[PDB]
């Protein structure tokens, strides 16, 4: 849009019904306008710009990038999308939908291992590309008995030993 003395970029919708209605904007506690007026005479309430909050799932071991979108959409995107400005920037390069949309095959594919590089909500995404594992948890569940006896999970092997953590103690002075 480009209204009277005000610029801006918005998605107008016929909303209801809050305003002054005699002078013709409505703000929400900041500089922004949320946003109807001006049309004659309705309620075209505006919003902020649409942005696809993209990301990258490298994986430098096999050198296979895989572009993930943030939270939208399996249905709204198009491959090498021409409605949008910045890939970024010059050139770009669709499976979800557990987190968001990804430009990377494939659907689950359960369950491994779990480890890095460990993307979002729960695609655990090993490589080789080949996303979306959900590798949890799983504890060796002893079952609860009913009567005076009660089962218990004692082991058999020792198998000691680990190196463990650094505790930092100082700075360089």
């Amino acid at each position: 849009y480009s209204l009277y003395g005000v610029s801006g970029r918005g998605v107008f919708q016929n909303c209801t019904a809050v305003g002054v209605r005699q002078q013709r904007f409505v703000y929400d506690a900041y500089q922004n306008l949320v946003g109807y007026y001006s049309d004659d005479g309705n309620y075209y309430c505006l919003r902020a710009c649409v942005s696809v909050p993209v990301s990258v799932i490298y994986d430098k071991e096999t050198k296979t990038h895989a572009t993930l979108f943030g939270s939208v959409a399996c249905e709204h995107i198009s491959s090498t999308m021409s409605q949008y400005s910045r890939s970024t920037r010059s050139m770009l390069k669709p499976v979800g939908c557990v987190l968001g949309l990804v430009n990377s095959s494939l659907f689950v594919e359960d369950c491994k291992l779990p480890l890095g590089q460990s993307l979002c909500a729960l695609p655990d995404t090993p490589s080789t590309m080949r996303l979306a594992s959900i590798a949890f948890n799983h504890p060796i569940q002893v079952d609860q008995l009913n009567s005076s006896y009660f089962k218990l999970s004692i082991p058999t092997n020792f198998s000691f030993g680990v190196t463990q953590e650094y505790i930092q103690t100082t700075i360089q002075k």
Binding site: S51, S55, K60, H65, S85, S87, S118
Partner: protein
């Protein structure tokens, strides 16, 4: 050292513009018409300049172009360029004419020198010349049987051919740069600053690796806005026909690259950071290698479509209601602060004449104004010659 650096670069995956030069028409004994593409009429915007991949296919087998069924070993050929500040058409209407001082980059001597010169190009008027009859395109040429004989290359062959189409006038400089003969791939570049036009080549500093370095600054201070590729045709006879390596022009723009410098100082790898999010991530870390994980690259914002402007509707009312007065009692409608559909108003009437002064009828519908005055009256078409500015 590796680094991220912001400068003029071509973008990753750019196919650029391809150009090819061909053997001309010939009988068994006699070269005839030149044979060229339509490059002279294809004037390009210089913008930030460009780089050129030269000779890449040299050594391989390819077609002779003018005789597609005939193959030959491909030899490197050098490109030629016409650059300047003002362009237009030749007398017969064809595009590709450069006005005032024009920069010409013209290889010569069977690929053993580059000439750079800055002159007014006066089109000549003989048959097939740009100010003459039967003009199609200008071009340059050389004649290998007589121009490229061992030990006696004709330095001026291409220059002489160019001088047949144009007289060179008021040249401020003519420089020559020697070139050693080989079939090695090379890169050429050109930019401009307030200091003049800068020429770049891989030849002198990185012949075997391709990095371009500055070898000249030309005293050309009029901003270059346009360029074209000067077609060359090789006046061989049929049995002497060769295939000449296509060259490729890629436009430059300011981009941030990851640059990987070897121990010896040369760049053998780079990343175009803006190519995609993966490359972006790759650039962050100030390294070629970026550790394996999720890396957030920015949006993807939608494109503006349907630019709503609000301000309404101009009141032409009292014109339609009543009797239009006589010319000497003309009624005046004033218009401040409103929107007008005038092609609306002129769709009611049948319109017999529309002339404007210091504006056009097309323009007067489109523009916005701070004040519009409409005067209307009764007036006979018979008296059109008296209603004039």
């Amino acid at each position: 050292i590796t680094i991220t650096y912001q400068g003029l670069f071509p973008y990753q995956g750019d196919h650029g513009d391809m150009y090819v030069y061909s053997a001309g028409h010939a009988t068994g004994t006699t070269p005839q018409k030149l044979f060229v593409a339509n490059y002279s009429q294809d004037v390009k915007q210089f913008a930030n300049g460009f780089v050129v991949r030269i000779g890449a296919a040299a050594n391989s087998t390819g077609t002779v172009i003018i005789s597609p069924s005939t193959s030959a070993t491909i030899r490197k050929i050098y490109p030629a360029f016409m650059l300047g500040s003002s362009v237009g058409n030749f007398s017969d209407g064809k595009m590709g004419r450069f006005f005032n001082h024009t920069l010409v980059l013209l290889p010569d001597g069977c690929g053993t020198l580059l000439r750079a010169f800055y002159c007014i190009l006066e089109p000549r008027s003989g048959n097939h010349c740009p100010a003459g009859n039967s003009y199609t395109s200008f071009a340059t040429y050389h004649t290998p049987a007589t121009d490229c004989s061992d030990g006696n290359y004709n330095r001026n062959a291409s220059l002489n051919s160019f001088k047949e189409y144009f007289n060179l006038r008021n040249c401020t400089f003519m420089y020559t740069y020697n070139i050693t003969e080989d079939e090695i791939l090379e890169w050429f570049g050109i930019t401009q600053t307030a200091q003049g036009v800068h020429l770049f080549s891989s030849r002198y500093v990185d012949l075997y690796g391709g990095n371009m370095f500055q070898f000249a600054t030309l005293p050309v201070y009029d901003t270059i806005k346009y360029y074209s590729i000067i077609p060359h045709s090789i006046r061989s006879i049929q049995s002497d026909r060769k295939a000449w390596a296509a060259f490729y022009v890629y436009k430059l723009q300011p981009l941030t690259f990851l640059l990987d410098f070897s121990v010896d100082g040369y760049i053998r790898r780079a990343i175009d950071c803006g190519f995609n999010d993966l490359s972006q991530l790759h650039c962050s870390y100030e390294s070629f290698d970026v550790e394996s994980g999720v890396y957030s690259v920015s949006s993807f914002e939608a494109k503006p479509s349907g630019s709503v402007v609000e301000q309404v509707e101009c009141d032409f009312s009292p014109l339609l209601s009543g009797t239009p007065p006589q010319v000497y009692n003309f009624k005046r409608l004033v218009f401040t602060n409103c929107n007008y559909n005038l092609t609306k108003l002129l769709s009611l009437f049948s319109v017999n004449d529309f002339t404007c002064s210091q504006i056009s009828p097309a323009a007067i519908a489109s523009n916005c104004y701070s004040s519009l005055i409409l005067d209307y009256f009764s007036y006979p078409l018979s008296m059109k010659s008296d209603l004039s500015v």
